[PDB]
Design an enzyme around this catalytic site. Sequence first.
Site, short mmCIF file in Angstrom:
data_model
loop_
_atom_site.label_atom_id
_atom_site.label_comp_id
_atom_site.label_asym_id
_atom_site.label_seq_id
_atom_site.Cartn_x
_atom_site.Cartn_y
_atom_site.Cartn_z
N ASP A 150 1.12 -0.92 -0.09
CA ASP A 150 0.20 -0.17 -0.26
C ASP A 150 0.87 1.60 0.25
O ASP A 150 0.42 2.32 0.63
CB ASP A 150 -0.48 -0.29 1.22
CG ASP A 150 -1.49 0.85 0.98
OD1 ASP A 150 -1.84 1.95 0.15
OD2 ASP A 150 -2.94 1.07 2.20
N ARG A 154 0.20 9.16 1.61
CA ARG A 154 -0.39 9.29 2.82
C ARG A 154 -0.25 8.23 3.84
O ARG A 154 -0.67 8.24 4.57
CB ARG A 154 -1.66 8.57 2.43
CG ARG A 154 -2.37 7.06 1.78
CD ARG A 154 -3.72 7.15 1.48
NE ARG A 154 -3.75 5.85 2.22
CZ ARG A 154 -3.42 4.48 1.51
NH1 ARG A 154 -3.08 4.44 0.70
NH2 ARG A 154 -4.14 3.15 1.72
N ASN A 155 0.34 6.96 3.68
CA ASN A 155 1.41 5.96 4.52
C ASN A 155 3.23 6.55 4.70
O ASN A 155 3.33 5.53 5.22
CB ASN A 155 1.47 4.61 3.59
CG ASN A 155 -0.47 4.42 3.81
OD1 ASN A 155 -1.03 4.81 4.60
ND2 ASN A 155 -0.70 2.83 3.17
N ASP A 168 3.46 1.70 8.17
CA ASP A 168 2.59 -0.06 8.04
C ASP A 168 1.21 1.04 8.70
O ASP A 168 1.31 0.12 9.84
CB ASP A 168 3.72 -0.72 7.71
CG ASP A 168 2.22 -1.64 7.47
OD1 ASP A 168 1.51 -2.00 6.69
OD2 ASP A 168 2.06 -2.90 8.29
C1 LIG Z 1 0.78 1.24 16.80
C2 LIG Z 1 1.00 2.49 16.54
C3 LIG Z 1 0.94 2.97 17.27
C4 LIG Z 1 1.31 4.89 16.70
C5 LIG Z 1 1.85 4.77 15.97
C6 LIG Z 1 1.56 5.93 14.92
C7 LIG Z 1 0.21 7.57 14.76
C8 LIG Z 1 0.21 8.65 14.48
C9 LIG Z 1 1.50 9.39 14.37
C10 LIG Z 1 2.30 10.21 14.35
C11 LIG Z 1 1.37 11.67 14.02
N1 LIG Z 1 3.51 9.88 14.19
N2 LIG Z 1 3.99 9.23 15.07
C12 LIG Z 1 3.01 8.54 14.66
C13 LIG Z 1 2.78 6.77 15.65
C14 LIG Z 1 0.38 4.01 15.02
C15 LIG Z 1 0.98 2.75 15.23
C16 LIG Z 1 -0.08 1.70 14.07
N3 LIG Z 1 -1.03 0.38 14.16
C17 LIG Z 1 -2.26 1.91 14.05
C18 LIG Z 1 -0.93 -0.46 14.79
O1 LIG Z 1 -0.61 -1.22 14.10
C19 LIG Z 1 -2.41 -1.23 14.30
N4 LIG Z 1 -2.82 -1.07 16.25
C20 LIG Z 1 -3.45 -1.81 16.66
C21 LIG Z 1 -4.47 -2.92 15.75
C22 LIG Z 1 -4.43 -3.17 14.48
C23 LIG Z 1 -2.92 -2.06 13.74
C24 LIG Z 1 -2.39 -2.10 12.81
F1 LIG Z 1 -3.48 -3.18 11.47
F2 LIG Z 1 -2.63 -0.37 11.72
C25 LIG Z 1 0.93 1.77 13.03
C26 LIG Z 1 1.10 3.28 12.04
C27 LIG Z 1 0.39 3.68 12.89
#
Ligand SMILES: Cc1ccc(-c2ccc3c(C)n[nH]c3c2)c2c1[C@H](N(C)C(=O)c1ncccc1C(F)F)CCC2
Length: 277
Positions: A150, A154-155, A168
């Site tokens: 993907d 946006r990612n 991811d």
């Molecule tokens: C765990 C996590 C912690 C911080 C972020 C983050 C966000 C924004 C910022 C910003 C703006 N700066 N830094 C940042 C970090 C993200 C995650 C994301 N994530 C939610 C997961 O891996 C995940 N978790 C639970 C269930 C499913 C999934 C998965 F399928 F997506 C991966 C990328 C975003």
Amino acid sequence: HIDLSALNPELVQAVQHVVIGPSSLIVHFNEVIGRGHFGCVYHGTLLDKKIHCAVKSLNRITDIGEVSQFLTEGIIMKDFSHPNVLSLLGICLRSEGSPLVVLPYMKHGDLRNFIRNETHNPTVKDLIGFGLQVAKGMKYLASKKFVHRDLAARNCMLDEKFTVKVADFGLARVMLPVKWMALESLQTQKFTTKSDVWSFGVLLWELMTRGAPPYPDVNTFDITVYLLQGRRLLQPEYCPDPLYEVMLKCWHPKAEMRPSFSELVSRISAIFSTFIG
Ligand SMILES: Cc1ccc(-c2ccc3c(C)n[nH]c3c2)c2c1[C@H](N(C)C(=O)c1ncccc1C(F)F)CCC2
């Protein structure tokens, strides 16, 4: 291969290797910096030295089997870290009912929003540099057998120092919006590093147009037929000629003929090098 969805000693030991002590993390619950299908992510403070971080709570440690494979892979393989890849800083197990997954803090958020923001003025050099950073992150992901699937602006995230990190959100795998997929992915649903190289070319085009939607002249239903007739995205106005040639190589219909991410790093580093001052 170790089970991340049920309590077992292998899961507990793997998580302990990346533990953040109970007195080392503070979650700023009023500062939501990320929202999406996954819920909210909060700004936080990691005490190592005070560092900005981003925190996602889980209902229990066994929910770690459901988070991104970038995070899961680091815990399992013990070797996953690159400046242009958004990966795990650690996990705080202070509360059993609320384990905290912590990643780096990216002030400027997603790259597409950053470049579309009318108040921001990234130069062509800055945009090409963001593209070079993405290729270096992807070259590392490819070396680790990761297939992003993907890859799009946006990612990708942008931090306060202008470091881009490929992020991811649940779709990467160790080995979708149709206007970013490679021809063979639209046709056979097969995804390789070469299909990521195709999405990368689209990503470069998004950077050179400051986040314009791709194929403004083609309906979503007709994208495959359009690509089958040899048609490609047009050269944006401020895109250097050699960068557009790199884009066209990314969209070659034969996957074997597309450049690797290492060659993309080399070609884009040479173009970026011409932007002096
Ligand atoms: C765990 C996590 C912690 C911080 C972020 C983050 C966000 C924004 C910022 C910003 C703006 N700066 N830094 C940042 C970090 C993200 C995650 C994301 N994530 C939610 C997961 O891996 C995940 N978790 C639970 C269930 C499913 C999934 C998965 F399928 F997506 C991966 C990328 C975003």
